[PDB]
Design a protein around this nucleic acid. Structure first.
Lengths: 43, 103, 89, 119, 93
RNA sequence: AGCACAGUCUUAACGAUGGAUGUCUUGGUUCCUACAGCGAUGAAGGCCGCAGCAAAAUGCGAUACGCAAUGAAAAUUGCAGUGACUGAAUCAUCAGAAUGCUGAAUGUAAACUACACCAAUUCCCUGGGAAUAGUGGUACUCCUACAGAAA
RNA sequence: UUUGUUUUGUAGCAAUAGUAAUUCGUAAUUAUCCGAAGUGGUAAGGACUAUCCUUGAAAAAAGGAGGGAACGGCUUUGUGCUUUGCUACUCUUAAUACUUGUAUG
RNA sequence: UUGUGUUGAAGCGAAAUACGUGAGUUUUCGUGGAACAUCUCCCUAGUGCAGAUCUUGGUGGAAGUAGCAACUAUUCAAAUGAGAACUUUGAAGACUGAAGUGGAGAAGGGUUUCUUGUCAACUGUGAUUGAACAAGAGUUAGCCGCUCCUAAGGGAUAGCUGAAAAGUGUUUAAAGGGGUCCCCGUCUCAAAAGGGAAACAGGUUGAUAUUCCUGUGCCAAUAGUAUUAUGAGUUAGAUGGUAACAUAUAUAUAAAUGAACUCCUUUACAUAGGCUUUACACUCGGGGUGCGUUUUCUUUGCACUUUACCU
RNA sequence: ACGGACCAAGGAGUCUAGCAAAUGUGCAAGUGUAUAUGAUUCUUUAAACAUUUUACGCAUAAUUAAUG
RNA sequence: UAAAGCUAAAUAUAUGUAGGAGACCGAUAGCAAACAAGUACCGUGAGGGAAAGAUGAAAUAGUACUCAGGAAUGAGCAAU
RNA sequence: GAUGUUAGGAGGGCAAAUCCGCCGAAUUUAAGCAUAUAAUUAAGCGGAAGAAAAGAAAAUAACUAUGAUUCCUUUAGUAACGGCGAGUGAACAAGGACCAGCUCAAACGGUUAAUCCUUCGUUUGGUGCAAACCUUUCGACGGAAUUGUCGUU
C-alpha cells in the first residue's frame, strides 16, 4: 500500500535493485530474476 | 464423544460475562469504627442502571473521616429510596428504609 | 454461496497473519500472538525439533557467515600469543 | 599514493589533517562521478586505499599510546585486556591447578618417583 | 571499555554523498533557488543543514527530505534569498 | 521441354526431433587418522551495506571484493587504471588495526529506524584550542566486599 | 458627547487570483464578473417526542471552582525575627544584549 | 596372463556366401575421435526386462480437430511503419448513464508510475501496442497520517505451581511521581475508521502536492540574567450590572495574586419519528459577453457571470 | 476378465546374525591361536608373518528335578 | 565397613574441522545439491523442495568479406 | 533481612556424533488380544567435555582364594524372567588393554587462627623488536573466620 514501514520500503527497494540484468562487460567473460505479476515477494 | 457445551462453559473463553458497560461491583461500605459505634450518613446522588442486572444501583457519597474528601459507594437500591436522600449506616442508625443496620 | 468454499472465499484472502520476524528474517512472525512460528523469537531459545532433520540442517551453524568462529579457526595450529606481531624485516 | 611506513613517523595532527584532505578529494571525485564526468573515476580506488592506510596508522598509534597509558595498573579495560576464549579466561590458572597442600607436597618431596634400572 | 580509534560516526564527508543533476534538480536550481543533494539515510534536517553550511558557505531557508527506493536520502535545500543557488551550483559543478 | 493419380502401408539412403550409448569428472560416498566449544571482551543465526563501470555467488564491514604486518615476489587487466629496475602489481600467511543494525540482546519498545533517564561528549597541542544532539552507561538473577538506614 | 439622512467597500482576505471574452510584437492591453426567486436532493446543527427485563466505552489532555499557605522596596541594631531614617513600587506581554553545548518545528 | 589403439579405441547405423540350436559371438562399410579388451585361470557384484493404473524423460494417432460465443457496434479517411480490423489523429454511428470501466482512499501488490527507446519471447488472431524488454528518472509536510491515549485484549514483573518446558498474573510486594514528612502509585504493548494542538486558496511538473512556488494564516515551544517598551494593580492582589451576567481591543483582549488538600465539567457516546435552520446541490426569470440555429419559426438554444482558510 | 498409446534409461530373493544338511579343504582325539602381544614389516601393509613346555569355544560321556 | 567428596589411562564418537585412502558411484548413478543448492519455486504457517555438467589443442583461432533480405536469417567464387 | 547504575565478578544463547539427568509412546510381534513385546526405544525438557560417566568395596567368593573404575575375548543365549506363550536375559571366576591413588567429616593442637581473601605498594631475576608473559617475598590496609580456617593422622 501507500502506507509503508521503513524496513518494508527498504526491502522493496533492495528487491527492485536485485532485479536488474547482468552487466554486459561482465557477460564479456541472471537466473534469480522475478516479475512483479508472476512471482510475489511474499515479504 | 466430544466435550459437551456445559463442559465448555467453564473454560471461560466466550462464556465470560459481558461486562463492558457495567458500572461497578455492588458492595456496601467496608466495616469501620463509625459503623461499629455510631452512624455515618451518605447522600445518594444518583440512581443508575447496571446493564447486567435488573435492580437499580445507588451511588452514595460519604464524607471520609480519616482524611478530608469524599468516597463513592455503589449500593443496591431499595424500593422507595430517592436521589437527595441521606441514608445512615451503623449500629445506631435509625430503623428506616434505606439505612444499613446490624440485623 | 458467492464467496463459496473455493474461489469466492479465496477472493477474501487479504490481511496476512505472518510477517518478517526480525530474528529469523523469515515471514513466520505471527502478528496476533507476537511469536515466530519458525524460531519462536520472543523466547530466548531457538525452537528446534529433532523430528525435522531438514529444518535443523537448513538453519544450523555454518549455514551463515560464521563471522567470528571462522576467524578463531586455525588459531590452534599457530598458538600466537595475543598482541604478538611477526618480526619486522 | 602514500605508503604506511612514510607516515608512521607523523604526529597525530599531520595524520588527521592529511586524512581530512584525502576525504575532501575523495568527495570531489565522487561529485565528479555523479556529474557526467567519468575521466577521473579510476582514482577513487587509490584515494580510498590511501584513506584506509592513514586510518590504519592513526588507529594503531592511538591503540599503542592507550596501552602505554594503561601499562600495568592491573585493571585495564576489557578491550585492552586479553581476548582469549571465554572458557580459557574462566579456566583455573596453572598455578591454581598445580597447587597442592602441605601434606601431599611434603609427601611427594620425600618420596618422589625416581629413575632406576633392572639388571 | 575504552575506544581509541577515531570516531566513525557520519561526518560531513559521508552525510552528503553528491549533488543530484537530473532534469528536475537542474531546473529547480534556477526556478526556485534550491539545490538537490543525495545523502545517507541516517542524516536528518539538522544534519544536512549544518553539513551543507560547513561544506559550502551557504545557509538554507529550509531542507525537505525524502527516502528514495535506491537506499539513499534526497534533500531539497532551499537556499536563502540572500545569495543565489545558480552561482554556488556553478562553483561546485 | 515432357512424364509420373492421390492417399495408406513396407524397405533402403540421407536428414529433422530427441538426448540414449560410449568416453570423460575440481563431485559424492564409505573407511581410517588427528584435533575440538563458541558466547555479555556480545556467539550462532538474521538483516543492511561495500567495487569506477557490479545482479548473483564468493569476500568483506563506513579503513567494507579489502588496511597494516610477514613470506614470495612481477604482474593485474573486459575497458579504465595501478605497478620495480622491491613495505608498491598479484598471491600466500595472518598475530596488529578495524569489525554497520540486530540477535542470549540486556534502558523501555517494536509490521515504530518510536521514547526515556544519568554523565555533556570527542578530538588536537604540551594548561590551552577546536568540533560535536554526537559518545558511553542504565535488564534479570546470583556471589564477595562495602554503604547508610531498621529491633 | 446621543438620535435620525447620504457616499464608499464584493467587510478585511479580494482581484493582484480565477473564469468567459476583445485586441496587440508574439509577453502586454481593455471590458464583465450584478438584479431578483423557486424545488427540497444531500449534509450538519437545533429544540423535541417516543422505545428498552437492551440505558447504549475509557484514558491521555484541558478547564472551572471550594480553600486561604507566602508576602513592598533602600539602609541599619542585636539574634529569618522587634527595631531606627526615606519611598514612588509588583506582575504581564514584546524586543534586544550577554551567559547557557549549537536557544524552532 | 597377453594383447589392440591417431595407419583411429569405445560407442552408434546399416549389413555378412560368417559361426552357433540358442542366448550370442565374430567380421564389413559408414560415422566417431580416445581409449579398449583378455575365453589363460580365478575373484567379485547395485549383473541381464515387455508388462508392475511401474519411475523419470522424450514422442505420437486423436488433429490443423474441439475450439478462440458473457459484456448491443462499428464505419470512413489520414499518419507511422517492412508489415495495420484490434498503434495514433480527424470525421461519423454508438455505449457507460453519476448504484459509472467517473473521481478519491483502505487491505493486498511493489515500481506495474514517468520519459525515451524498443519487439527474442509474452501480450491464446495481428500488433509498429503494452502492466513485456532496456536505459534513465520520479515520491519534498510543524498543519495529511503514524508517532500520544485508552478498549476488546496481548506480553512481562511479584509470587505460586511444574523435572523443566511452561501455566496463572497481587493470590504474605519493603514495587516511580508530587509537594515538603506525608500523599498518590505494577510495567509495557494493542485503533492509519474510537479520543486527538494547528492550513487555506491560486499556480506549478513528464512523473509529487493541503508536502513544491506565491500570498495569507494557525498551533506548539521558547532557559537564566539585565535592559528597554506595553499595559494593568499598588500608599497584599481591578471594576461595572438589581439580576441573568459583563469588562483588559496594548501591532497582540497578555496580566483581575493565590500554596497544600478537595469537588466538579469537557473529552463522552443508543435507537426511532417527525418539525425546523443553514450551507452545498438543482432549477426559474432579468442584465452583460461569446457561440450555435436561421428553407421557415424563434426578443431564441447553450456556456461564463466565481470568492477559500483566517480576522 | 484386469494391465499395456509409443520409445529410451532405471526397475525387484539381497545383506547380516544364527542353525543344519550337502560338498570341497586342512588337521585329527583333538581342532580353532580369541582378545592381545612382537617385529630393522610400516606406499601397498587396514595385509602378510609370528606366539618361553593347563585362556576360552566345540568335541572327547551319559543320565537325573536333584544331593549326584 | 553405607548414608560426604576428588581422580589420569585403557573406551565412544551418523558433529565440526583437517589430512589419507577404496575390488564404491560415474550426471535418472553418487549427498537433495559435480552448476549461482537447501538455490529457484510452492505453502498463511509448521514445512515442502527441484531441474540444470562436456565446442575446440588453442577462441591470445567464437565465424572476417560479398550477395539477397526491413530484419531474422540464407547462400557463396568468401572464411578459422 | 531489605535497599543501592557502590567496587569486582558469574549465569543466560548457539552447537550434539560420542556423553550425563528427567520424561515418555504407539506402530510392531504374539498369526486375534488385554499381561508381555516393541522399549527402560522414538518424540519432548534440561546439562557437560575433548572425551563424559564410573571409580578406590557396607565388592566377590567359599578357593591353595581374589582386590578401585572402564573397555575387549569369554562366561552365555547360560542362571533366570515370561498368557512359562511369543519372547526376554544378567552376574562371578578366566584371558587381555590400561593401571593410581587420594581428602573432607570425626580425632588431636589454645603460653594464644598457627588460617583465607580484597586493595595498595617493594624487589629476585628471566625469555619478547614490541605487545605482552613467566618467576619474586618484604609488607601495610580493609575484611572473612572460634556458629571453626589451617596443621597432624
Amino acid at each position: 500500500g501507500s502506507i509503508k514501514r521503513f524496513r518494508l520500503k527498504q526491502r522493496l527497494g533492495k528487491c527492485r535493485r536485485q532485479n536488474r540484468p547482468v552487466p554486459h562487460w561482465y557477460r564479456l567473460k541472471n537466473t534469480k530474476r522475478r516479475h512483479w505479476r508472476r512471482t510475489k515477494l511474499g515479504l | 464423544g466430544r466435550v459437551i457445551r456445559g463442559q465448555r462453559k467453564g473454560r471461560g473463553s466466550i462464556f465470560k460475562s459481558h461486562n463492558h458497560h457495567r458500572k461497578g461491583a455492588a458492595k456496601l461500605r467496608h466495616l469501620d469504627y463509625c459503623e461499629k459505634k455510631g452512624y455515618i450518613k451518605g447522600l445518594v446522588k444518583d440512581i443508575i442502571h447496571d446493564p447486567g442486572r435488573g435492580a437499580p444501583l445507588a451511588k452514595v457519597i460519604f464524607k471520609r473521616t480519616e482524611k478530608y474528601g469524599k468516597k463513592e459507594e455503589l449500593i443496591i437500591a431499595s424500593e422507595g429510596m430517592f436521589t437527595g436522600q441521606y441514608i445512615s449506616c451503623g449500629t445506631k442508625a435509625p430503623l428506616s428504609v434505606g439505612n444499613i443496620l446490624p440485623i | 454461496g458467492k464467496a463459496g468454499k473455493g474461489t469466492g472465499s479465496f477472493g477474501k484472502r487479504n490481511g496476512k497473519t505472518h510477517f518478517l520476524c526480525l530474528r529469523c528474517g523469515k515471514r513466520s512472525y505471527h502478528l496476533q500472538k507476537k511469536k515466530c512460528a519458525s524460531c519462536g523469537y520472543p523466547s530466548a531459545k531457538k525452537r528446534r525439533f529433532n523430528w525435522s532433520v531438514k529444518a535443523k540442517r537448513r538453519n544450523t551453524t555454518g549455514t551463515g557467515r560464521c563471522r567470528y568462529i571462522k576467524t578463531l579457526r586455525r588459531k590452534l595450529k599457530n598458538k600466537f600469543t595475543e598482541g604478538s606481531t611477526p618480526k619486522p624485516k | 599514493n602514500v605508503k604506511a611506513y612514510e607516515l608512521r613517523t607523523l604526529k597525530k595532527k599531520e595524520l588527521l589533517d592529511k586524512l581530512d584532505e584525502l576525504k575532501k578529494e575523495l568527495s570531489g571525485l565522487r561529485i565528479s562521478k555523479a556529474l557526467g564526468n567519468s575521466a577521473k573515476n579510476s582514482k577513487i580506488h587509490g584515494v580510498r586505499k590511501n584513506v584506509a592506510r592513514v586510518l590504519t596508522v592513526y588507529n594503531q598509534k592511538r591503540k599503542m599510546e592507550l596501552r602505554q597509558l594503561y601499562k600495568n595498573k592491573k585493571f585495564k579495560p576489557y578491550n585492552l585486556r586479553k581476548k582469549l576464549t571465554k572458557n580459557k579466561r574462566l579456566q583455573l590458572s596453572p598455578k591454581q591447578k598445580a597447587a597442592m597442600t602441605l601434606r601431599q607436597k611434603k609427601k611427594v618431596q620425600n618420596f618422589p618417583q625416581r629413575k632406576y634400572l633392572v639388571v | 571499555i575504552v575506544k581509541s580509534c577515531h570516531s566513525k560516526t557520519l561526518d560531513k564527508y559521508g552525510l552528503i554523498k553528491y549533488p543530484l543533476t537530473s532534469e528536475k534538480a537542474m531546473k529547480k536550481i534556477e526556478e526556485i533557488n534550491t539545490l538537490v543533494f543525495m545523502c545517507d539515510k541516517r542524516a536528518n534536517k539538522k544534519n544536512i543543514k549544518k553539513s551543507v553550511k560547513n561544506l559550502f558557505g551557504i545557509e538554507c531557508d529550509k531542507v525537505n527530505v525524502l527516502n528514495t527506493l535506491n537506499g539513499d536520502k534526497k534533500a531539497y535545500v532551499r537556499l536563502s534569498g540572500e545569495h543565489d543557488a545558480l552561482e554556488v551550483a556553478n562553483k561546485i559543478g
